Amino acid sequence: GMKIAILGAMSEEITPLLETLKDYTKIEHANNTYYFAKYKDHELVLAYSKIGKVNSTLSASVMIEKFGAQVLLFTGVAGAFNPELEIGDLLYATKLAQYDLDITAFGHPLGFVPGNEIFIKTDEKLNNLALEVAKELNIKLRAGIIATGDEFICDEAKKAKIREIFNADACEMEGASVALVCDALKVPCFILRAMSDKAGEKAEFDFDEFVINSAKISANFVLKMCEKL
Template sequence: MVVGVMGAMPEEIEPIIGRLENVQKHEVAGNTYYTALYGSIDLVIAYSKIGKVFSALTAATMIEKFGVQKMLFSGVAGAINPELKIGDLIAATKLCQHDLDITAFGHPYGFVPEGKVFVEANPRLLEIAADVARKLGVKLKQGVIATGDQFVASLERKSWIGETFNADALEMEGASVAVVCDALNVPFFILRAISDAADMDAGFDFDTFLQSSALKSAEFIFAMLDEL
């Protein structure tokens, strides 16, 4: 089985690459893809760079050029739901694009014709994640993740996203990876550890907690590999 592990930033995938042996490097379309054998799994690992376009390109490249059959995403997010504190894990049940807006034509936020507002993650991968969380004794929330090409550092914007999409957390890549995987029939799982609360302090908190939260997410994803 070929499994893709994506992040958006180096900090999000380095902890995974660091646990592997005989890692090979491949340069495709301006990105580095790392391949390695882990047990019986052929792993393909990359960080995409930040945002929806780069992450869509990386997801599509992993699937079309490297033959990825299951996609796992590891990274950090801003919390919307006040239950979520820095370092907490959230797995997306479904994802939406909060910055997609053709409401001028009577469509809901996040919708374009022939698309859908929400793309659902693979239920079996969510089950596996719940089992892994129980085994590791860590808390894993399941919820809605909203994605957009914006670093959100405003209570007003964060509340709007929370109210409009009933979203629990926000970030900048999950929904674009979801759209690509959904279109190409590849089961996907998006995991995030909270780095900030998308408020006035978000920039500072993000810089402070990126590494520790990215590591928590990566460790969880690594544990999931044994259960696929």
């Protein structure tokens, strides 16, 4: 089978994968750690992306240009903007934009730079595979538009504005950058996000506990995708 990159937006999302895989090697490279394992006739390369657009762009580029990944699966968390969503809901991104990429001073729309487009799409075949896996695991999986930028946004008015401009369902700091790298390098990309916060709700749950539970589900989910690839 093809070589598969598994990127996690938090180190806690990688831990349960490594525990399941058990036998793996690693290298320290690009001020990060990359892990190597065999699973179901696929070679895997895994890493925590590190935080934000630059870090995640670099990690994805290393996985493909250095380690030869042919597919990339990216698990993480996101803040929900769409009122229909709830804490813990799993979303796959259909397309993503950078809300903080701004040369609007020159008459361009927000998120656009010449040489690129506002939105980057993820891979349809991988998304359909994820829907199959969700069905087989009895997990609810929804499609959404993700806005990415290098701020952790707490301003409710800003969340509403990003939603309005991009029709964004959720928001995080690494998705669009990784999707762009993968598209540029002709590597199918899948982006999975668990909703870790809702716009206009005070949390009322422990984040650490949420992360551990969501990471367990996401780890099993992406390994099941690997098994079918």
